[PDB]
Amino acid sequence: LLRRYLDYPVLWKILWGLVLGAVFGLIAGHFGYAGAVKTYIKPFGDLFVRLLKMLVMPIVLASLVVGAASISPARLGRVGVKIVVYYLATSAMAVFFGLIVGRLFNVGANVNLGSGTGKAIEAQPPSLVQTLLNIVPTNPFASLAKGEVLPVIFFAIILGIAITYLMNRNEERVRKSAETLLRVFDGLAEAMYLIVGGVMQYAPIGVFALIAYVMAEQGVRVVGPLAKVVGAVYTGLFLQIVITYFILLKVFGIDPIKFIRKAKDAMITAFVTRSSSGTLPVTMRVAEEEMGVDKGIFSFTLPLGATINMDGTALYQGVTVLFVANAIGHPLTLGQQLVVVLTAVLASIGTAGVPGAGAIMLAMVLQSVGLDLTPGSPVALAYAMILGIDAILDMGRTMVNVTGDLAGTVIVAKTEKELDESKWIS
Amino acid sequence: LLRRYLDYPVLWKILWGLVLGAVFGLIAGHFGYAGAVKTYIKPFGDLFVRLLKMLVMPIVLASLVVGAASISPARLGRVGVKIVVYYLATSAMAVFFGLIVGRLFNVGANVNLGSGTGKAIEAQPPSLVQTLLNIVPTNPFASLAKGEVLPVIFFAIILGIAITYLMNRNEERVRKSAETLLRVFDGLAEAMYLIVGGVMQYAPIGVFALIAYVMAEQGVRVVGPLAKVVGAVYTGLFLQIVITYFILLKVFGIDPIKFIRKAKDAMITAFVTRSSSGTLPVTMRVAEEEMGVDKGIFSFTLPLGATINMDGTALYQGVTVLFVANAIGHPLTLGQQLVVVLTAVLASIGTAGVPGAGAIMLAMVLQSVGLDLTPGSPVALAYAMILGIDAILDMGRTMVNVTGDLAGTVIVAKTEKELDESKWIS
Amino acid sequence: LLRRYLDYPVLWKILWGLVLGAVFGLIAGHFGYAGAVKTYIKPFGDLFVRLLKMLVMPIVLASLVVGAASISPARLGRVGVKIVVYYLATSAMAVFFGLIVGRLFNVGANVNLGSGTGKAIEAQPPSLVQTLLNIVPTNPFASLAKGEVLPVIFFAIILGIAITYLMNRNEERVRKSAETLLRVFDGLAEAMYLIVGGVMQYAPIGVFALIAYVMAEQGVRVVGPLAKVVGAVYTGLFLQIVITYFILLKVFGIDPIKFIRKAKDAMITAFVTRSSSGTLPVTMRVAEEEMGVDKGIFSFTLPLGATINMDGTALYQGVTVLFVANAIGHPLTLGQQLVVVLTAVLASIGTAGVPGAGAIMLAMVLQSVGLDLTPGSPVALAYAMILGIDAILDMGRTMVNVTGDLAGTVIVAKTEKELDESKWIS
C-alpha cells in the first residue's frame, strides 16, 4: 500500500520486518535457493549497509562540534571527564565479563583446526603510546577522507571548544562568524538526523534482506560449535547489562527497571538495525522526551558514546579472541588476559558505528595478541567461521552498546542534578 | 592589447581561438616542429584542462544541493522522475543510434591488428546490481576526495532534500541553521559560477593550445582508417540530434528549429571547450534569459543533466566499442549489442564533465564486453589509435551532450507548464 | 602548579622549556638514558608535532580565503605581485647565499662515503613546467585530503577573489550567500587561531620533549663533520638576515634595527617551536599591534608568506645539497648551481609549515640534481646524518622564515603607504 508503509511506526515496523526475515530465510533454506536470495535480495541489505555507512562520518563530525560548542567549557570539561572515565571503566568491565563467560562456557574447544607448532611465542606487542598518539589527526581532511573516526572526533571536539571560546569575544566581526559556523554545523547535524530518519523508515526492507540472507545462507550453520559462541555472547551481554548497568544506576539513584522500561524503544531499534551511529535520532529522542536530560548532557555524550562507548562490541571481541585462541590450541593466561583487556578497549573504541564493523576491527586485536591473519593459517578459517554469525552477534552487541550509552548519559546527568526527576516518579 | 582581450565576447573569442588553432597546428606540421609546440604550448592546454577538472566536483556538489533544496519535495520528485526517465531513455537511444551508424558505416574495417584466437569467450559480465549499489557513497568525504561523481551527486541530492524538509520545521534554532547552510552552499555554487566565467575568459588561449597541439601532432594522423571513425561519430551525433531531439521537442510542442536557434550560443561553447561541467553558467544563462524556464527546473535539471546526461559521450563509446571489436576480428552480435547498450549508459553517466574523460571511461566499457586492457594485447594499440582523435571526437560529443541537456530541461518544463511562452511567439 | 602554568607568559615559557631541555638531554646522555627518554618522553614531542600538523591545511585554506576576500581585487593584484616577486627574489637570494657559505666553509669534505663511478651523468632534469602546472589542483578536495599545500593555496585564493566579486553584486539572494560563506571561513580561521594559541600553551612541554630527545640521542653526534654543517647553516642564516633583510629594509625607509627589535617576540617563538604555520597568531598580532600594518596586508601576505615564503628552509636545502654532493664525490658546478637555485625554490615553496618537513622535501631536490634516494646508495647514509641533526637546523631556518615573512609584509606595506609611521618615531 502506497504511503501506508511509511505510516506504520518505524519501531514496530522494523521489528516486524526482522521477525518476517527469519521465517523467509527458513522457507528459502527449505527451497534450498540460497543463491537466488543471495543474488536477488542481498543487494537490498548491502544497499542498506552502505546507506548506514554514509551517515557515520558527517554525523560524528557535525554533531560532536555542535555538542562541544553548545556547552560552557567548564561544564564541558566536567561532563567530558565524568563520561570518559565511565566509558573506559565499563569497556574494561565488559571485556573482563566477556573473558569470564568465555572461561565459563569454554568456547571453541573441539573444532580441531590444529595450528602447527610454528610462530607462537610472540604474543604481546601492545603499542599503547602509538595508538594513543594516533588520536590527534595529522591532517583532519585526510582523517575524514580515509575514514578514521577517532581523529575526526578529536578534531571536532577541539573545534567545538574553539567555537565556544569565540562566541564570548569582543569584536562583533569575530563573534558573528563563529555564530555562523556553529549554525552551519548545526544545520548539517539536523539534516543528518532527518536523513537518518529516512534511512530508518527504509530500514525494515533492509533488515528483511540482511537477516533473510543471513538465515538462508546459515540456516544450517548454527548447529556446530558456533552454537556455544552465539549462546556465550548473548549470555555475556545479558550479564554485562544486569550486573554493570544495574549496579551503576541503582547506586547513583535511578531505578534500573525504569531505565530499561524507558530505553526499550531504542534498545529494540538498535537490536534490529545492528548499527550504533545509525540510531542517534531515536536514542536522543528517547533520552530527551522519555529519560529527560537537558540538551547540554545528551547533545554531547550520546553523540560521543555512539562512536567510542562500545561495550557490546568490546565483549564480542573479548570472547572471540579467546575462542580463536582456544580453537588452535593456545588458551590465554593472566598476562594475556591483562593485555587483551587493554587492546580490546582501543580496538572497539576506534570502531565506526556501522554494521559489520565489529568483525573488521577483530583483526586489530588478533594481530595484537600474537596471532596472524594470512589466509594460509587456520586462524583464517576461524575468522571466517566467526564472520559467519557476525550478524547474529552484532544484532545483540549493538543493543548493548546503545543501552550502555543511555546508562552513561543518565548517570552523568544524575551526577549533574539536571535530571527530569518528575518522570521517575508516579 | 591590455584589458581588450577580456572585453572581447567570450563566445566569439572562444571560436576565434579554435579557428586559429587549426591554422597554426597546420603551419607547425608544415614546419615539422610538433615537438616544439608540444614542449612549449601544450602546457597551456594542460593547465586549462586541469582548471576544468578543478571545477567539476565543487560545482556538482554545491549546485546539486542548492537545486534540490530550492524545490518543494513533491515538485522535486516529479521533476526528478520526469528527468531521469528522459536521461536514461535518450542515453539508450543514443547508444543504439551509435551502434546503427557503426553497423552501416562499417567502422574499423581493415586495420589488421590481428588478435590471436585466445581469451575471447568471456564477453558479458554486466555487473548491473553492483555498479548501481555503487551510487550510495560509503563515506561522502571519501567519494569527494577520490573523485567519484555519482556518489557525490546522490549525497548532495539527499542533503538538499533534507534541507528543504528542514526549512519547514518549527524549532527556530533549526530553521535558521538550515537557511544558513543552504546560503553557504548557494554562495559556494555562485562563487564557482564566477570562477567558471573567469576560466571561460581564459579559455581561448587554452583552446589555441589544445587544438593546435592536437593538429600539429595529428596533422597527418587523420588520413588512415580513423577518417571513417571521425566521419561516423559526427554523423551519429547529427543523426542523434535531428532524429531524437527533433522528434521529442516537436511532439511536446516546442519547435526544434527555434530550440537550436536559441541554444547555439551554448552549443558552440560546449563544442569548443569540450567540457560539460565547464559550461554550466553559459547553458543556465541561455536557459533562463532565452529559453525561458523558471529556477525550479534549470537550477536542478541542468546542474544534474550536465554531469550524468551524456548522449554524445554515450554514442562515442557505443561506436568505439564496436570499432575495437571489429578491428581485432570479433564483431558484436545482438546479445553483445544489448549488453553494450546497458553498460555504455552506466559508463557514460559516471563520467565527470571534464575534457578527455570519454576515453578514460572507455575502459569500463571495453573491459565490460570481453576485451582486456593490458598493453601487450593489440587492444592497447586500438585504444591508443582512438585516444589519438579523442580530441576531435570530444569536441563534438560535448556539444551534443549540452544540446541534449537543454532539450531535456525544456521538455520537463513543457510538461510542468513553466515555459516563458513569450519568446516562442513573435 | 595548577592553572599557574597557563598564566605564565607563553613566550618566556616556550623559551624556558627549550633552555631546560638542553640541560635535561645532557644529564640523560650522562646517565646513558637515550632509550628511556626515547620510549617515555619522545611521545610528547611526537604528539606536539602531530598537533602542529593538524593546523596546517585548515589554517592555510580558511585564512587564505578570508585574506584574499577582504581585499578589493584592484589592491589585491598589486599586493600579490609585489609580494610574490619579493618572495621569489629573496628565496633565490637565500639559496645563492647558502651556496656561497657552502663554497666558503667546504661542508662535507672528509666523510669518505665514496660513491662508486656508477650512475652520475644524469644530473639536470629540472621539470619546471610540470611542477608549475601542478599548482592548479585537479580536484581541490583531493588536494586537501592528500596534503598538497600549494594547490589548496591557489584554490583558496581564487575562491577568495570569487567571493570578493560576489559581494559586489545586485541580487540580494547572492550577496547574502557570499557574505555568509565568507563569514563561515572567517569563523573557521579564527577558531584555528584560537586552537593554535591553545597549542602554544601546551607547546613548552612539547618543545621540551623534542629537544630533550634530540639532545639525549645526539648528545655526542655533534662532534664529527656535522659541526661544520651546523655552523655553516647558522652563519648562512645570519648572513641572509643581515645582508638581505637589512639592506632591503634600509633601502625602503624602515630602520632594520627597529624591525628586529619589534619582531623578536615572534622570531624567538618561531625559533623555538620550529614551525612556520604554527606561529601565525603570534606573527600576525606582532605585525598588527607592534609593526602597525592594517588588515589589508598582514591578513593575506603573512598567511601566504608563512606557507610559501621560506628563505631559511631554502638556504638549508641549498647547503645540504652541496654537502651531500661533496660527501660522495660530485661537487656542483655553475650549471648545477643555476639548476639547484631553480629547484630549491620550488622545493621549499611546496613545503608545509610543520616541523621536520625541510628534511622531507630535501628528497624532491636531491632527486632533482642527479642524486638518488634508494636505501642502497651511500645517500642513505649521508641523508641519514643530515636528518640526524634536523632539529638544530630547523629551529633556526623556521626563525629566518618568519623573519623574512615579517620583512616582506612590512616592505609591501611601506610601498603601499599603509604602514603605521607612528611606531617608528620616539
Ligand SMILES: N[C@@H](CC(=O)O)C(=O)O
Ligand atoms: N554494531 C556495532 C558495529 C559492528 O559491530 O559492526 C556498533 O555498535 O557500532
Ligand SMILES: N[C@@H](CC(=O)O)C(=O)O
Ligand atoms: N566532454 C565530455 C567528457 C569527455 O569526453 O571528456 C563531457 O561532456 O563531459
Ligand SMILES: N[C@@H](CC(=O)O)C(=O)O
Ligand atoms: N621549518 C620549516 C618546516 C620544516 O622544514 O620542517 C618551516 O618553518 O616551515
